[PDB]
Amino acid sequence: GPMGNGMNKILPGLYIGNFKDARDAEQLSKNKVTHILSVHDSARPMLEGVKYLCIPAADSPSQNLTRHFKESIKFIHECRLRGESCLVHSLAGVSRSVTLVIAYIMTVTDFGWEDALHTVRAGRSCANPNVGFQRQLQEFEKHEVHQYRQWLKEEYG
């Protein structure tokens, strides 16, 4: 459905869901979620037992998400390197959250944005960044992802 069917594993330690999934104690426990990247209109810390990164942002082509790629990647990566699990969520788990996860996948692989989107969709079929986020990801692939891959190597080996 258009808001998914529960949070979905994208890679080990990396999940995407909707806002309800992000407060679902059963889902959070089953998936061992200890970090939440919340990217939606009213993102703020809510639950106990969870490290948050909160990015108030709209699901619109006029919303800049590129300026949040680096902090999102650092947050996700440092969680995953410690063997912990991170949920990236938006309202629907379709666009804002998916875009940040695509940037992450592009940085930890050699993938362009389309192969990264394919990866996300294999785990969460409803993934579909808005057309503006798609263009931001294309620009990121063209001009900056190679700098991010080098930063990742320098900072984390």
Side-chain angles (χ1 to χ4, degrees):
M3 308 183 78
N5 312 136
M7 72 178 68
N8 297 110
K9 179 182 164 193
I10 307 306
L11 287 171
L14 185 54
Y15 296 78
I16 295 173
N18 66 38
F19 77 91
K20 183 262 191 194
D21 304 325
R23 313 302 148 217
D24 187 326
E26 279 189 277
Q27 290 190 66
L28 295 164
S29 162
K30 169 180 62 189
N31 294 321
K32 297 190 301 229
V33 174
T34 60
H35 290 63
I36 294 177
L37 198 176
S38 178
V39 54
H40 62 91
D41 290 350
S42 56
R44 61 185 187 93
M46 303 288 321
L47 303 174
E48 293 169 62
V50 169
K51 289 176 184 154
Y52 280 91
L53 168 57
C54 299
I55 305 174
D59 183 17
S60 168
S62 60
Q63 171 70 56
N64 180 320
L65 285 182
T66 61
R67 65 164 53 107
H68 299 291
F69 285 2
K70 179 63 66 68
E71 73 175 343
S72 300
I73 291 162
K74 184 181 152 74
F75 180 78
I76 295 162
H77 204 57
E78 293 187 6
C79 172
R80 297 185 66 259
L81 286 182
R82 311 191 64 158
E84 300 184 39
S85 281
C86 178
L87 166 72
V88 185
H89 89 87
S90 42
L91 189 77
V94 167
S95 175
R96 280 166 289 199
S97 45
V98 166
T99 296
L100 299 181
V101 171
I102 288 166
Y104 181 77
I105 292 167
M106 290 171 69
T107 300
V108 302
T109 68
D110 68 354
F111 292 2
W113 79 274
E114 292 203 83
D115 279 337
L117 173 57
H118 176 88
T119 302
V120 176
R121 282 184 173 154
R124 186 155 173 94
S125 52
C126 66
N128 192 28
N130 77 50
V131 286
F133 294 166
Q134 295 183 22
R135 301 176 297 242
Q136 292 181 45
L137 289 164
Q138 308 162 5
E139 288 303 298
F140 177 62
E141 172 174 349
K142 283 220 233 303
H143 307 300
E144 213 170 348
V145 66
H146 288 89
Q147 290 178 15
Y148 274 50
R149 294 175 180 143
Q150 184 56 37
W151 161 85
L152 192 91
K153 180 183 177 189
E154 291 168 357
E155 182 102 9
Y156 307 102

